[PDB]
Each structure stands twice: as C-alpha cells, then as structure tokens.
Design a protein around this ligand. Sequence first.
Ligand SMILES: O=C1O[C@H](CO)[C@H](O)[C@H](O)[C@H]1O
Ligand SMILES: [Mg+2]
Ligand SMILES: [Mg+2]
Ligand SMILES: [Mg+2]
Ligand code: NA
Ligand code: NA
Ligand code: NA
Ligand code: NA
Ligand code: NA
Ligand code: NA
Lengths: 211, 1011, 170
Amino acid sequence: PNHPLWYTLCDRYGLYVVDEANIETHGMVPMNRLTDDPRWLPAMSERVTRMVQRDRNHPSVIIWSLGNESGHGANHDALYRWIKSVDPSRPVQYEGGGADTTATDIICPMYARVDEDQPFPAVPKWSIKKWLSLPGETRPLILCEYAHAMGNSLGGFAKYWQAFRQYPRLQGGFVWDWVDQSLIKYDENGNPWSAYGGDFGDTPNDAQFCM
Amino acid sequence: RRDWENPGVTQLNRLAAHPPFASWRNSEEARTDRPSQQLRSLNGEWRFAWFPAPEAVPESWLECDLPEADTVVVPSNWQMHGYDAPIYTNVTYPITVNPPFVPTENPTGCYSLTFNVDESWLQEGQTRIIFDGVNSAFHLWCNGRWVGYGQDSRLPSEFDLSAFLRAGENRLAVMVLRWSDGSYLEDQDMWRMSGIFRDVSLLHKPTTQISDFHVATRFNDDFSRAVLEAEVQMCGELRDYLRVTVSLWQGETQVASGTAPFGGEIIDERGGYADRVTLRLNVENPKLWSAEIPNLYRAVVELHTADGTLIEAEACDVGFREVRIENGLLLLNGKPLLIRGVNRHEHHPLHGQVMDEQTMVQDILLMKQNNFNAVRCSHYPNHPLWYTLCDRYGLYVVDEANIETHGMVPMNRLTDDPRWLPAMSERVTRMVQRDRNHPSVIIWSLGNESGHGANHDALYRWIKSVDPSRPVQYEGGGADTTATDIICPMYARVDEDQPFPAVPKWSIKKWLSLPGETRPLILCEYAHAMGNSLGGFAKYWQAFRQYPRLQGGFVWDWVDQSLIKYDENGNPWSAYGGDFGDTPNDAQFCMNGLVFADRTPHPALTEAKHQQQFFQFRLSGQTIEVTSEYLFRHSDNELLHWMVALDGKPLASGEVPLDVAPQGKQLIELPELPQPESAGQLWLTVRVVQPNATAWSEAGHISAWQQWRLAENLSVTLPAASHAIPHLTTSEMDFCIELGNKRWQFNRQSGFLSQMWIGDKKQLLTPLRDQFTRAPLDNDIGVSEATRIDPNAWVERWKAAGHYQAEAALLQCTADTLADAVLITTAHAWQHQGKTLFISRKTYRIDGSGQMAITVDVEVASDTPHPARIGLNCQLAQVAERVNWLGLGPQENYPDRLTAACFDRWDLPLSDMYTPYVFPSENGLRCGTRELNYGPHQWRGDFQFNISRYSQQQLMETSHRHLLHAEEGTWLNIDGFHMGIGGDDSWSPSVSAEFQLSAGRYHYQLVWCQK
Amino acid sequence: RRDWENPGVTQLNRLAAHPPFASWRNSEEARTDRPSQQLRSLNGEWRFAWFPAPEAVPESWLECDLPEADTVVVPSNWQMHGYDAPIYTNVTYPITVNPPFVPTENPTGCYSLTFNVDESWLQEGQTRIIFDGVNSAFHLWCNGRWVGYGQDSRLPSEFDLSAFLRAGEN
Ligand SMILES: O=C1O[C@H](CO)[C@H](O)[C@H](O)[C@H]1O
Ligand SMILES: [Mg+2]
Ligand SMILES: [Mg+2]
Ligand SMILES: [Mg+2]
Ligand code: NA
Ligand code: NA
Ligand code: NA
Ligand code: NA
Ligand code: NA
Ligand code: NA
C-alpha cells in the first residue's frame, strides 16, 4: 500500500491503480510455505483487509492485489473470497502459483513472452497468446510485470504492443519498472555518485539488480 | 496482559493441530490399534482451588500446592462439584456484552497435579502435554515456569514440555478462566460450565517425527477402482535415508503398500516441500464405507530409514467413500442420501459436559436402533472418541466449528468484523486439521447462529481449498447464503412459509425451486422435540421421500439437557434453568430431547423410528409390496412377520423371508385368509424383524412396521332383551336412577352426573364434567426465552379468551321415563365476561341392561380461539393396577403424532399411562380408542383418552415432575376430539390447521357400563 | 514478551482501519478539502538514538530525553542518516530463515518528541496518534506509559492517546 497522497493524485490526474497488499515471501521454500500455513492467515489477513478498509473509496483504485511472490496458499483463496464479499466493485488479482490460479480474476503473469513458451514445471509461463485459449480458460490477461527495463533494455517492446492490439483479451500490462533504485553516495571530494547493492558494506547483496 | 480479553491472542506457544497421534514405536501395535506406551493419560485425581477472579490467585500456588485446595477428579466441570453454579441461558450471553471484555469477577479454577516422568522420555525425543478440552481459556505452568496459553473449549491445546520437565516428580499448574474473549464465540443454547472437562495426556514423539498426515480416496465412475493418497509431513532432521511407508490393511491382510523418500513434487518457482511426501496406493474393488455397512481398512504410516529402522508409526481407520454434490443432490458413493439425523450435544445429567465411552456407545446404539443414520455435532467439535465410534458403528457426521454469537445484535456483528477473523479461523482450521481423516465426517459446518459475515465466506473458501472431499454448510444469515453448499434451514416448515424480513424460512418444498436455486436441502434443525412434541413429524418424511432434493434433516435434539439435584432426603430429581440460583435463565428450554437425560426414551422416539424406517410398504389385495430405501446393503438380516387380528383377536399370522436389493422391491402374497365369524374390523400388521444380533442391535430387533385396515363387517345384530327397567327417583336436588345394584345420580343444580354406585360402593370423587382445556404443553406455551411472552401463543390466547376460567351455566336438566330406560337431558353454556364460549347438549340413556349411553353435541364460538380438547373428565374413586384398551398404542400418541402407534388390544400398568416429562403438561393420551377398561368400568365408542393420578389442574400448576403428588383415585379424561400438539418449533403456534378443532360443532358418543 | 517474534501478535491496542479522516468541524472546509484544525502534523525534528538491540535501550529513555540522542528530521529511514547500512537483496531474506524468529542483534531506532495539545483537546473528545508508516514494527509510549504495538510497514497504525495526554508538555 502506498503513501496516502498517491491515491489522491491518481484520482485527480487520472491513473488506473492496482492496490497491492504488503505481502511477499519470495525467499521461502517452497514459495508458499507461509501462505499455505493457517498459522500465518491472521498476519496476512490484516495486510489485505486493512488495505481495503483504507483505500476502498478511491476511484483510481480499480483492482485489488493479494501481494507478490508468495506462491499460492489456501490463505490466498481465503483472502481472495474475503474481498469479493466485502468489495464486489473491484476485480481481485494475484500472480503467485502460476498466474492463473483460483485466487485471481485476471491471468496476470510476470515476464510471459509474446510467442515463446517457457514450460517451467508446475508454474509454466505460456506465450500470452496461447495462455488465453488453453482449454477452459476465459479470463482476460494483463501482465503484472513485463519488459524488464534493466539497463540497456526494452528490446522487443513493440512485439508486446502489436499483440496487445490484435488480441481483445490481451489487455496490456505493467512494465518493470519505473525508477532505478540507486542511492546517492559522496566521494572524498564530496561529489555524489549513484550506488547500488553492496556499496554500503551490505552483504550478501544483489548488486545492480535493484536498477 | 489479560490475554483472556484480547481476541487477537487466542494462544501462546501452542503446538500446531493435527490428526490423532499415538507415536507407536512398533508397526504391529499401530496396525491393531493397541495401547501406546508413548501416550500416557493424566486423568485422575488432581488438586483444585476456586477463586472469584484471577487476581485472587496467590503466587505461591505456582510453586507449591495450596492447603485450601481439594482433591477432585479430572476431567470434570467444576460446577458439577458445586464450586459455583452452572448457568442455563439460551440467546442472551451469560456476561455483559462488551467485547472483548469480560466481568472483573471472573470465576477462576486452579488445577494442579504432581506426576512422574520416566527419565527415558527426557533423554530423547519430544514430550508434550495435551488438553483435549478446557473451558474457556487457560494458562499453563510446569514446575513454576510459565508454558503457554490457550482458548477454544472444544479442541485440543498442546504444549512442548521437554525443557520444563525433570526426571521423577513434576508439577503442573493450570489456571482456567470461566470467561474470556473466547466466550463471545461460545453462545450455544446449553448449560454454561467450565473447567478441564476432557482428557489430559502426555505424548512422546521422536525428534524426527510425523507432524501431520492426510488420507484421501478417489474413485473411478463405478467405484470398481480407487486410489488412496496419503500426504505425510515430518519435522526434525531431514535426511536422504528417511522414508515413509504407508500400508493398507483389511483385517490381517495387507492389501496395498507404498514406500518413498521425502521431497514432494515441484509446486512453485522455489521448488517443493522437501519435508513432505505423497504415497499413492491402487486398490481394486474396494469395500466401500457407509452408515449401512461401515467397511473400514487400517492405514499404517511408518516413518523409517531406507534400511529398515522404524522411527515411529501413526495410523487411522480408512473408510473408502466419496462425498460429492452433483446436479443438486448430495451423493454418497454415487447414491443420493436420505439423512435420518439428529442433533446431539455432549450432555450427562451427573457429569455435565464430560463425555465417557459408555455414554457415547449407548447413544449410538440407541440412535441406530431408532433408525437414525446421521448426527450433527451441535455446535462444536466433539470428544475425539466420538468420531472413532461413528467410523466403526456407521453414522454420517457433520463436524461443526465451535462458533456461535447468537446474542450479538445483529447476529453477525463479530463474524463480519475482520478483527475477529483470526479467532474464528482457528476454530475452523484446527477442527479440519484434526478430523479430516475420519470417514464418518461427510460435511463441515462453519458454526451455528452467528449471522452471516465476510469471515464466513473467507473460511468457507479456506475449507473448499484444503479439503475438496467434503461439502461445506452453514445456516446463518438465511440458510442459503454464499457460505453454504447445502440449503440448511432450521425449523423451516413443510408447506407453510414464514416470510421473516431478511432471513425468511420458506416452505422447504418451495425453497428448492426459488429462481436460480439448485442446491440440495437438508435441515440442520427441525421437529423440535421439546416435551410433548414431534407433531407433524410424518409430514416432513412424506416430503423427504417425494422430493429428490429434499434429503432429510437433523431432529433437535437427542437428549434433554437436565441436571441431577437432590432433595433433603438425598433423593435425585431433574433440574433445569434457574434451579441453581442461576439468573437470568431460560428455564426448561434446555430440554428438547427425544430421550431423557438418563437416556430413557420419550414417546416421540417411536414416532421418529417409524417415519425413518428403511422399508416402505404398500398393500394390494393379498399382496404386500416391500420397498427398500437402503442404498447399498441387501436385506440379509430381515424377515417379515405378519399378523391379522379381529379387534385385537389374533386370527392368522406367519413370517416370510425378506430378500430385497437396495432400492428394490419384493412382492409377498398372503395366504388365503379365513373369513371371520364375529363382526368387527380386521387389521393387518406387518413388521420387519432382524433374526441375528448385530454390533448395534440384539436378535429379534424390530426395525419397521405398518398397519392396514382389511375387511370390516358392521354389527347388525341387536343386543338381547333387557330383563328389568331402571327406576327413577326424584327430589328437588337430584334425579336418581336405579337398576339392580347400580345407581346413577344427577345433580339438578349442576346438571352433571355426580355419583354412581356399582354394588355397594360409590365410583366418583368428582362429577363427570365437560373439559375444553389441557395442562399446556411446552409447544402451547411457545417461548424460547423466559422473558418473552408471545400473546399469540396458544396458552396466551386460551387464557385471554377465558377458557381456563369459564364457568358452566346450566340451561336445562330434565328426566324422562321410557318403556325400557330413563333419559336425562342436559344443556350447559360456558361463559366468560358475558361471552358464551361453548355450549354442551347431552343425553344420558340408562336402559335395562345397565348401560349408560352418553351423547354429546358441542358448539364452539367461531371467534373464540379453537379449544385444546372437547371431552369429559372426572376423578374415579378407585385405583386399579392395569389399564386395558382397544385402540392406538401401546405408547402415548396424539392426533399429529400417532402414525407409529398400532390399533390393537393393549394392557399396561397404570404408571405407564403417564409420561414423566420434566416440565409437567397434558400427557399420556392414546387415540383411536374404541374400548377402555379400568377396574369395573368399561367405556366404548370412538375417543381419545389419558388416565392417571394427576389432574390437568395439578399438571398445570407444577413446574417439575418430582413435585407432583398422586391424587386420591384416578383422573380420567375422555375426549371426542383433541387438538394436535405441533412442534415444528416451540416458540410460535405450530399446530397445523387440520389438527385444530375449528369445526364449530362437534359430536361424540360414549357408552359407560360395568365389565 | 518479544511480540516482534510472534506472528500471532501483529498489534496491541491498535485502532480499527478506516478511510482518510480529517474530522472537519465545518462543512464547507470539508467540501473544499481545506485544512482541518482537528488534524495536526507531527512531522519535523525529533530526537533519535540508535541501538544494536532492544535490550540495549535504557529504561531512562522512557522518562526523559537521552543526552546522546541526535535531532533528526521525520519522516526518514535511519539508514539515510548514516546510523546503519541499507541492505539490497532480491530473493534471499536479509536474515536467517527461521520463522518466527529474527536476529538477537536487531537494529533499534529510538524516536521521541516533546509536544502539547490545545486545551480543549484535554477537555473532551478522542485524540489519536497516526503513524502512516513504520518499518517494520514498534512499541509506543506516551508520558512514560506504554500505549501499544504495531506491525506492517506499509499501512497506518493508530492509537488512542486520550487517556495519556496532559496539560503542558507531553
Ligand atoms: O435454533 C436453534 O434452536 C434450538 C432450540 O432448542 C437450539 O437453541 C439450537 O442450538 C439453535 O440452533
Ligand atoms: Mg484472547
Ligand atoms: Mg443459539
Ligand atoms: Mg508479532
Ligand atoms: Na487487446
Ligand atoms: Na530487481
Ligand atoms: Na428426497
Ligand atoms: Na433449547
Ligand atoms: Na433376509
Ligand atoms: Na406445568
């Protein structure tokens, strides 16, 4: 959940917002170890319910998100239903566990390619055109993350947009991401320079992967 | 920190819930389910001290035993020991509604125990203590050191004591609080007690252990093949040498087995569960489990090293069955179920809410003997043994979460509050985690009467997610919300709608077809058996059998929640609300069972057994069509016994072997019956007898029966000629008729028969008078809260109309001497405040044979509430030992509750003609009676009657059966007509129109003579 | 009670969540969305002291300012002021994965602020304190008395201070 003023600005300047609960357990093994554990349901539910209770009147918020990279747990299904019950005005999405589980109204993969499949075991990232028509599937597809803009990047960006425009159910996505997470540091001469992972003695760290 | 006033803290240091563990260290023992040395019981004599509040408990108690304490038995409810009073309140909370706060004066029970621990348990593995039930919250200490905290009174709380124990003597200190924020979720309609009411045990597990395991059974289209999947979870040192072996047994024969190392399949980008493994075993033509035939297999889960070293083994009984809802029908192994269920609380008249095996077994045997096949755990998870028993004897179970917030306003104030979601989820999730392997459990319930909140939807989905093998139901908020797979209303009537705002209770037939509705309907509660009740019960079962989607319901309920008290002479008597100084209270509304607290049946139990029969019959000429409502079993322990009798006189009889396939039919043509000599009605009575004893019944057990009127030959022969002629003697005050040794006396002032003489003795203590009222039944009083007096209740309407105060006004009284008899004509009018309620016109014809023909014709004002009865009553001077009659019996039966009774010649001791309802009311009636015999007297005609030593007046003025005193002589009530008793619920008029005496004009005739 | 190592305790005495409030006492001010005198900002210069673990925090800190504390701007992340190093890791947790436990060495930031309220606030009404964001958990004290606890670094944590306030400096 963002600083309260962000939603007011989006309401006024006009930007569609996906409000996401502060829940990410990426480092767990497997990713859903905690989210599928009934003992963590209470902590998770407050992160979802208190978000909804705070931002439910903002017109800019058009979609609720259960969080990020926490696999797919029964806690997600429970909280998904909680929202649908409390606020039927907004669709609920969540990418964890395969991007098309029972906890999301929208097929929302991260980095699924336009034409090329990535048949990872359990959590495959199908070509987005193919994903749409898998037997039984009918939901819309909007990538929660795509076109990773790390450094000299965004190659193949036009391929996505040609697809978004030709396929009615391919409704876009959110580029990753807006601003480099670099921090300022000063050399002996007092001159500032852009720093990243490990430049503060922090270790282990993931170097430039924060930009 | 006052954790007992924080819905955010429902436990501290409590271990995760799981299925029943015994930690066997020998596979064979696990297979045979014999005792486990690793599982000890700490039940027995403990120390106990009561305190008005926790702040009163002295610090010394934590380290040393309190001198003031007493030695009591555990498990037990401390109210049953007299430390404080048990409180019976229905809806209104026993404490002020100010969540999450509880009264500062909070009864606190300090339990303590000194016990031994073998050094062997502390040298390796983990030693935990398990409290199966503590009401309602508690703190634990071991040897002076604080261990943990827990809430929810109906599920086990476990704690690791490995680092607190010492070899030899140890001391536990448990401070149990009566009230806690947990109480807000425990407002069930029952006695509010407290203490350590369930088993306390010590379990020892290896460091590398089985921490959890789930068993599932999937089938192919025709159930000719199955796959048993067992997911096993472990804790501790994870190594490549570890393995899990799940073997399935049928008796001593291993039918299947699978072995595998840990490391589940990949589930997400981070991999899978390295601490889990799933074994899949193929089973061909498995023996399916059902309440009809509870086939069970034994599954043994072995944790071991690849090379053969057993670390530990766990196990459970596996019932191969599939529960699914398809096309609107609840199916068991592919067949539509017809739920013959009942709600059952855990109650004992002496021990309170503490359950024991014998009581559980008795209940199950009684339930199955009375054709019940299902039970609902109203309204909390039960004692662990209950499920094992239901698995083995065969009963479908609805496992219900310990959540009820009935007293809140509105009912969903807390269930719709996300801040209460945590406390609620634990009551649901821990239940499922504990009972998911029991085959007997076929449906999960989210709780009872807590309205409908978002929390319910969240938890509904949580269960659908973790356990897709069982349907989920919940009645709150309308009985058909998004939180239930089954339309499960309570007290919805068969044909009549009750359009309550927001939460209407539609007629069940109409409910099924509401636009868009497709779900099956099974009432979670119906046919309230409070006192003299269950009228209209047959109407439900006729509908259940005609409507596919009406699949039954659970009667409310199994046993009266009465407690035993003692008088000055030390004699026991049944007590209810308010009998312990408890107030506010809801008096007798805690007694709604088909059986008494001591399990003695109420008359209504036979009505239930009859309507719930598994065999249906139809007659056509000499042929009896038998249909089986069994879904799986054949009638391989049933024989049909038939009997034809003429007005109680046996003419013919015989038996035929029953051989009908489930859902099948069998035709049985009866022999060429011999045309009877005497005049009268021939009656055919058939009954299904179980030749062989079973695990739930004795040899000869009768499971079903049905009666039919056969040929009837009306008597056209006139009785012999009378020798003498009755003589009339007149005085201003009376008309006295004499014929031999017999004398009749009619008071000319009252207009009633005031006396009769048979030989040299008088026969009446009170004159024979009209009666239009009855001691009000609980259904007539119609209240569920001792504070609400519904003016619409039958008793209130009769009282306001003056039925109980109307006095008889004589309009006519004349005598006439005929050729061979004397005729007495009378007319009375009952009035109240210038309003004529009833008019009774009679004639008494006493002829030369010594018989008195009484013809009665009554008019009832159309605008006065329909009368409870239309008959006569009097107090006979004598008391006989037996009561003999030709009519419906042998047990008590009323107009809307008499399908179970059979027409025949019955003979019972006087005492059996009185039903001992704890709260006294009209009782013991028997209908369709053509002849009644008592002492020298005989009454003939077509009436209903009850006979006892208690007058309607005494019954009406007495609150407890033990306060009744036999009156002199015998009170007789003979009715031409009697109102139905109803019972669809006991807090509103529930007697169907067809059983209301609204005809305006009534006629009945009786012949009184000597036998 | 080490509430920061128990997922069963995500807060203590925290008020219920709700949409943005200002408690306008004038309808036109609310319509125009102008400022509300009933809503005060406490952003500015606070007193801060860093500690390697909560056990290192001196009980004296609850009663009066710590001499070794510095004056810093709030809101802010103490890493940006140089009290300790910000850490950049993608997937792998920055602490040993052993739920619900965290390191015994747990950087602790002790913030404090002396203030006072309008006389009428001491008279009637409910006065609450709102922390729009605290990373990652915290205990709150007012005039030396414990008020509450709260988690979740990205949503506001509110507490009723009504029964703690007093005339003069708080
Ligand atoms: O609706 C109900 O009716 C019964 C009345 O005896 C009893 O109170 C049950 O617990 C409740 O669910
Ligand atoms: Mg609590
Ligand atoms: Mg209730
Ligand atoms: Mg915590
Ligand atoms: Na598109
Ligand atoms: Na990154
Ligand atoms: Na049916
Ligand atoms: Na009741
Ligand atoms: Na048979
Ligand atoms: Na009475």
